Structures are given as C-alpha cells and as structure tokens.
Design an enzyme around this catalytic site. Structure first.
Site, PDB file in Angstrom:
ATOM      1  N   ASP A  13       0.622  -1.203  -0.129  1.00 38.60           N
ATOM      2  CA  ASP A  13      -0.074  -0.483   0.216  1.00 38.60           C
ATOM      3  C   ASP A  13       0.547   1.346   0.431  1.00 38.60           C
ATOM      4  O   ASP A  13       1.013   1.819   0.820  1.00 38.60           O
ATOM      5  CB  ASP A  13      -1.070  -0.266   0.861  1.00 38.60           C
ATOM      6  CG  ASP A  13      -1.237  -1.392   1.497  1.00 38.60           C
ATOM      7  OD1 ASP A  13      -2.150  -2.418   0.518  1.00 38.60           O
ATOM      8  OD2 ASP A  13      -1.822  -2.183   2.530  1.00 38.60           O
TER       9      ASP A  13
ATOM     10  N   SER B 221     -13.513   0.055   0.894  1.00 37.13           N
ATOM     11  CA  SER B 221     -13.253  -1.456   0.294  1.00 37.13           C
ATOM     12  C   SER B 221     -14.060  -2.545   0.859  1.00 37.13           C
ATOM     13  O   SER B 221     -14.477  -2.201   2.240  1.00 37.13           O
ATOM     14  CB  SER B 221     -11.825  -1.972   1.268  1.00 37.13           C
ATOM     15  OG  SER B 221     -11.315  -3.445   1.518  1.00 37.13           O
TER      16      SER B 221
ATOM     17  N   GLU C 257     -11.995  -1.698  -4.006  1.00 43.35           N
ATOM     18  CA  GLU C 257     -11.233  -0.969  -2.405  1.00 43.35           C
ATOM     19  C   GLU C 257      -9.976  -0.029  -3.276  1.00 43.35           C
ATOM     20  O   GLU C 257      -9.104  -0.410  -4.477  1.00 43.35           O
ATOM     21  CB  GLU C 257     -10.699  -1.941  -1.907  1.00 43.35           C
ATOM     22  CG  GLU C 257      -9.120  -3.139  -1.902  1.00 43.35           C
ATOM     23  CD  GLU C 257      -8.923  -4.023  -0.636  1.00 43.35           C
ATOM     24  OE1 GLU C 257      -9.429  -4.212   0.134  1.00 43.35           O
ATOM     25  OE2 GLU C 257      -7.743  -4.618  -1.060  1.00 43.35           O
TER      26      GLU C 257
ATOM     27  N   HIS D 188      -3.413  -1.734  -4.953  1.00 41.35           N
ATOM     28  CA  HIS D 188      -2.827  -0.256  -4.148  1.00 41.35           C
ATOM     29  C   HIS D 188      -2.086   0.333  -5.089  1.00 41.35           C
ATOM     30  O   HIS D 188      -0.861   0.621  -4.354  1.00 41.35           O
ATOM     31  CB  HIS D 188      -3.094  -0.730  -2.649  1.00 41.35           C
ATOM     32  CG  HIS D 188      -3.123   0.197  -1.402  1.00 41.35           C
ATOM     33  ND1 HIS D 188      -4.445   0.077  -0.623  1.00 41.35           N
ATOM     34  CD2 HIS D 188      -3.211   1.615  -1.477  1.00 41.35           C
ATOM     35  CE1 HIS D 188      -4.536   0.694  -0.142  1.00 41.35           C
ATOM     36  NE2 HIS D 188      -3.996   1.585  -0.675  1.00 41.35           N
TER      37      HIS D 188
HETATM   38  O1  LIG Z   1       3.335  -8.430   4.759  1.00 39.96           O
HETATM   39  C1  LIG Z   1       3.623  -9.035   6.112  1.00 39.96           C
HETATM   40  C2  LIG Z   1       2.671  -7.498   7.057  1.00 39.96           C
HETATM   41  O2  LIG Z   1       1.982  -6.768   6.378  1.00 39.96           O
HETATM   42  C3  LIG Z   1       2.178  -5.798   7.385  1.00 39.96           C
HETATM   43  O3  LIG Z   1       1.240  -5.218   8.440  1.00 39.96           O
HETATM   44  C4  LIG Z   1      -0.304  -4.918   9.008  1.00 39.96           C
HETATM   45  C5  LIG Z   1      -1.031  -5.743   7.267  1.00 39.96           C
HETATM   46  O4  LIG Z   1      -1.490  -4.940   5.962  1.00 39.96           O
HETATM   47  C6  LIG Z   1      -2.587  -5.001   5.623  1.00 39.96           C
HETATM   48  O5  LIG Z   1      -3.309  -4.710   4.758  1.00 39.96           O
HETATM   49  C7  LIG Z   1      -3.968  -3.970   4.023  1.00 39.96           C
HETATM   50  C8  LIG Z   1      -5.234  -3.317   4.006  1.00 39.96           C
HETATM   51  O6  LIG Z   1      -5.333  -4.624   3.013  1.00 39.96           O
HETATM   52  C9  LIG Z   1      -7.371  -3.916   3.021  1.00 39.96           C
HETATM   53  O7  LIG Z   1      -8.499  -4.615   2.837  1.00 39.96           O
HETATM   54  C10 LIG Z   1      -8.230  -5.711   3.709  1.00 39.96           C
HETATM   55  C11 LIG Z   1      -9.712  -5.817   3.837  1.00 39.96           C
HETATM   56  O8  LIG Z   1     -10.628  -6.479   3.021  1.00 39.96           O
HETATM   57  C12 LIG Z   1     -11.560  -6.356   3.200  1.00 39.96           C
HETATM   58  O9  LIG Z   1     -11.799  -8.063   4.289  1.00 39.96           O
HETATM   59  C13 LIG Z   1     -12.083  -8.741   3.322  1.00 39.96           C
HETATM   60  C14 LIG Z   1     -12.631 -10.503   3.346  1.00 39.96           C
HETATM   61  O10 LIG Z   1     -13.324  -9.953   3.602  1.00 39.96           O
HETATM   62  C15 LIG Z   1     -14.748  -9.176   4.408  1.00 39.96           C
HETATM   63  O11 LIG Z   1     -15.938  -9.372   4.241  1.00 39.96           O
HETATM   64  C16 LIG Z   1     -16.933  -8.811   3.192  1.00 39.96           C
HETATM   65  C17 LIG Z   1     -18.244  -7.369   3.615  1.00 39.96           C
HETATM   66  O12 LIG Z   1     -18.657  -8.451   4.547  1.00 39.96           O
HETATM   67  C18 LIG Z   1     -20.367  -8.002   4.163  1.00 39.96           C
HETATM   68  O13 LIG Z   1     -21.337  -7.896   4.566  1.00 39.96           O
HETATM   69  C19 LIG Z   1     -20.171  -7.619   2.929  1.00 39.96           C
HETATM   70  O14 LIG Z   1     -21.351  -6.835   2.473  1.00 39.96           O
HETATM   71  C20 LIG Z   1     -18.952  -7.852   2.240  1.00 39.96           C
HETATM   72  O15 LIG Z   1     -18.281  -6.280   1.409  1.00 39.96           O
HETATM   73  C21 LIG Z   1     -14.438 -10.810   4.492  1.00 39.96           C
HETATM   74  O16 LIG Z   1     -14.559 -10.630   7.017  1.00 39.96           O
HETATM   75  C22 LIG Z   1     -12.593 -11.210   5.477  1.00 39.96           C
HETATM   76  O17 LIG Z   1     -12.127 -12.205   4.600  1.00 39.96           O
HETATM   77  C23 LIG Z   1     -11.415  -5.723   4.217  1.00 39.96           C
HETATM   78  O18 LIG Z   1     -12.541  -4.734   3.666  1.00 39.96           O
HETATM   79  C24 LIG Z   1     -10.130  -5.734   4.686  1.00 39.96           C
HETATM   80  O19 LIG Z   1     -10.038  -5.605   5.907  1.00 39.96           O
HETATM   81  C25 LIG Z   1      -7.007  -2.710   2.168  1.00 39.96           C
HETATM   82  O20 LIG Z   1      -7.127  -1.844   1.379  1.00 39.96           O
HETATM   83  C26 LIG Z   1      -5.318  -2.251   2.453  1.00 39.96           C
HETATM   84  O21 LIG Z   1      -5.687  -0.720   3.398  1.00 39.96           O
HETATM   85  C27 LIG Z   1      -2.786  -6.280   6.383  1.00 39.96           C
HETATM   86  O22 LIG Z   1      -4.318  -6.862   6.949  1.00 39.96           O
HETATM   87  C28 LIG Z   1      -2.196  -6.157   7.554  1.00 39.96           C
HETATM   88  O23 LIG Z   1      -2.534  -6.917   8.697  1.00 39.96           O
HETATM   89  C29 LIG Z   1       3.332  -5.513   8.689  1.00 39.96           C
HETATM   90  O24 LIG Z   1       4.210  -4.450   7.389  1.00 39.96           O
HETATM   91  C30 LIG Z   1       4.218  -6.856   8.150  1.00 39.96           C
HETATM   92  O25 LIG Z   1       3.934  -7.547   8.737  1.00 39.96           O
HETATM   93 CA   LIG Z   2      -4.319   4.569  -2.101  1.00 40.63          CA
END
Ligand SMILES: OC[C@@H]1O[C@@H](OC[C@@H]2O[C@@H](OC[C@@H]3O[C@@H](OC[C@@H]4O[C@@H](OC[C@@H]5O[C@@H](OC[C@@H]6O[C@@H](O)[C@H](O)[C@H]6O)[C@H](O)[C@H]5O)[C@H](O)[C@H]4O)[C@H](O)[C@H]3O)[C@H](O)[C@H]2O)[C@H](O)[C@H]1O
Ligand SMILES: [Ca+2]
EC number: 3.2.1.99
Length: 318
Positions: A26, A163, A200, A270
């Site tokens: 990102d 997202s 997203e 991203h």
């Molecule tokens: O790589 C090693 C480590 O990474 C770093 O530390 C922090 C990490 O980076 C984060 O990722 C950045 C974010 O990723 C994107 O969005 C992620 C998730 O997607 C969506 O959830 C996914 C999935 O679907 C969900 O449900 C969907 C909704 O529910 C219904 O009601 C609705 O109708 C549906 O649409 C499920 O629950 C899920 O399984 C979420 O929106 C979002 O959480 C973002 O765009 C970026 O911001 C990573 O997660 C962090 O831990 C360090 O450097 C290193 O240690």
């Molecule tokens: Ca961005």
C-alpha cells in the site's frame, strides 16, 4: 493545486530498476527537496527514503505508538500496524491520512497527521496528531480505510476511500480542516454491484478534463494466491458516473484492467499515480513469486494514449 509535487523531474527519463529495501504494501510517494519518500502499511506507518527515486532504504515510521484516540474507534485493535497511508501537500503543510482497522471488519477509522516537513532531521519535524477524519462501524455499509485526497478543477479537496461493503466512497473536504466539510454527504462512486464486493483502494487523478478513478479488484494479502488487479475508469465530474473504456459503469463492475500481474509479480494493486511535467508514474505493490509472495514496491512509467486512457508497457528487462 500542486498537491503532489515532483519538481522539474521527468519520470520518462528515469530508469526504474528499483534497488534496496523494497518490501512494502500500500505505497504512496512524495518528494521534498531532492529526497523521495515512500509511505506504506506497517507499524506506525512505515517510511522509506531515497536520494534518486530508484535506490530505497527503510528510514523510519510516522508514529512511535498508536495515538490514544484510536482505541475508542477500533477497540479490538491490539497492535500498531496502520494501513494504506496517503500523502498530499497543501498550504505549505503535509497532510498524511492513514487507516486504523482490523482485517475483515468495517470498524475502522481514517486518521490525519500533519507536518511542516517530511524530514526528521529538519528541526521543524513534528507529526501533529490531528485526530479522526471519518469512521465506519458495523451499522455502516462502507469501510473507512484506504484514504485518498484529490483536488478538483476548482481547487476543492475531496476524499475518496473504501474497501468492500457498498464500495468506493467520496466526500468533500473543508479546505481549512482537511476533514469532511460540515454537512457534506458520502457518495458511493464505484462498486462491483454485487457480493462479495471486492473493490478497494481508490486513487483519483484529474487529467485533460476527466477525473480518472483507479481501483484494485479482487483479493489482496494472500501472497502468491492474491488475485488483485488494477482497474480504471473516468468521469467528467468528480462525483461520477465513472465509466470504463468499454463504457461500463464503475457502479456496476466497470473498470478497464491496467495490470493483472505476470508469472513473477502476482496480484498487483493498491496503486497511486503521479505526474511531473508531461510524465507520469504508477506506484503499487505486487506479491513476489520468487520471494515467498512477499509484497514488493513497484514504480513504473505510466503512459496515456490519444484517447486519454492510461497504459503500461511490458516490463523492461534489467
Ligand atoms: O505482509 C506482512 C505484514 O503486513 C504489515 O502489517 C499490516 C498488514 O497490511 C494489511 O493490508 C492492507 C489493507 O488490505 C485491504 O483490505 C483488506 C480487507 O479486505 C476486506 O476484508 C476481506 C474479507 O471480506 C470480508 O467481508 C466482506 C464484507 O462483508 C459483507 O457484509 C459485505 O457485504 C462484504 O463486502 C471478510 O470479513 C474478509 O475475510 C476488508 O474491507 C479489509 O479488512 C485494505 O485496502 C488495505 O488497507 C494487513 O491486513 C495488515 O495486517 C506489516 O508490515 C507485516 O508484518
Ligand atoms: Ca491508496
């Protein structure tokens, strides 16, 4: 408004064979002086620096620890990784937006930090914690992560984010607070139109009388099984309707695919787009198939065709 300045720099004259500390997800970029900065997801927002744009070193982080107010917005968060920063430069001030959330849920908040300089050596350095910008809870049908700020043709600032859930949101900002204007309303400006709505990471730019909305489709964050891709559409008005090159509404799954990845670089996404003169770059991450799927910084020149649409060329060979 020169909210993403790069100077006389010509991105098409630089050879973007990136070297050094490249692990990231990102990413955004900014340049202050001759120094370049990449802000990306990680503990307290992670920062890299470079003196040429090509050789990168890990430099630091924005927050020593999570601001205290964040706990109120996202009480289940028990670690300090902040997601998907966005940077812009406005009224002589740096506005850094970031996301506080937990994976798979939409209890989330976008925060704002400001600084007079990006450089910690500069005695003016101090990231002022300016608190919350916009948030989402379980009762909302959107997710307050992944901010992006753009300036419209009248110099008004706008925030896009989102997202999953109902998709990509947009809201007008106030020029003083750089937070949503008093009675401003949230608009949904893109959606795959069905479940699970794997759209997203918006990034909006204004070029040659159109706003271009870049987004990421499908699934990040799975290393070598990530299915992320970069897609784009455009509109004459920043509020939409955004349509792809085939004329399909981005509120119904429209979006022209810019990059779906290759055998090495899996699940590119991203992204962020910057200009300097008549040159442009696309910045994103991709999951390195030759290094255990590790998310890796990518910066590539981005070209525009005669109809105004963006495109990438094949990867150089090094
Ligand atoms: O790589 C090693 C480590 O990474 C770093 O530390 C922090 C990490 O980076 C984060 O990722 C950045 C974010 O990723 C994107 O969005 C992620 C998730 O997607 C969506 O959830 C996914 C999935 O679907 C969900 O449900 C969907 C909704 O529910 C219904 O009601 C609705 O109708 C549906 O649409 C499920 O629950 C899920 O399984 C979420 O929106 C979002 O959480 C973002 O765009 C970026 O911001 C990573 O997660 C962090 O831990 C360090 O450097 C290193 O240690
Ligand atoms: Ca961005």
């Amino acid at each position: 408004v020169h909210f993403h300045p790069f100077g006389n720099v010509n991105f098409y004259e630089m050879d973007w064979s990136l070297k050094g500390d490249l692990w990231a997800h990102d990413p955004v970029i900014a340049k202050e002086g001759s120094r370049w900065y990449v802000f990306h997801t990680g503990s307290g927002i992670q920062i890299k620096t470079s003196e040429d744009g090509v050789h990168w070193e890990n430099m630091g982080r924005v927050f020593p620890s999570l601001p205290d107010w964040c706990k109120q917005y996202v009480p289940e968060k028990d670690e300090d990784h902040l997601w998907a920063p966005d940077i812009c430069f406005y009224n002589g001030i740096y506005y850094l937006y970031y996301s506080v959330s937990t994976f798979g849920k939409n209890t989330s908040v976008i925060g704002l930090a400001t600084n007079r300089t990006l450089d910690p050596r500069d005695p003016d350095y101090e990231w002022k914690d300016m608190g919350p910008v916009i948030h989402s809870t379980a009762s909302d049908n959107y997710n307050a992560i992944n901010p992006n700020v753009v300036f419209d043709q009248e110099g008004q600032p706008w925030l896009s984010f989102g997202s999953f859930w109902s998709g990509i949101q947009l809201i007008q900002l106030d020029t003083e607070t750089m937070k949503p204007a008093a009675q401003a309303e949230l608009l949904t400006i893109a959606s795959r139109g069905e479940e699970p709505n794997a759209i997203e990471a918006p990034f909006i730019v204004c070029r040659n009388g159109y706003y271009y909305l870049f987004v990421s489709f499908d699934f990040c964050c799975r290393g070598i099984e990530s299915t992320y891709k970069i897609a784009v559409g455009r509109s004459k008005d920043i509020t939409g309707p955004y349509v792809d090159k085939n004329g399909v509404s981005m509120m119904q799954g429209g979006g022209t695919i810019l990059d779906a990845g290759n055998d090495r670089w899996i699940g590119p996404g991203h992204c962020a787009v910057y200009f300097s003169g008549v040159s442009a770059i696309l910045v994103n991450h991709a999951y390195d198939a030759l290094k255990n799927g590790e998310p890796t910084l990518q910066i590539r020149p981005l070209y525009w065709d005669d109809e105004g649409w963006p495109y990438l060329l094949e990867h150089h060979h090094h």
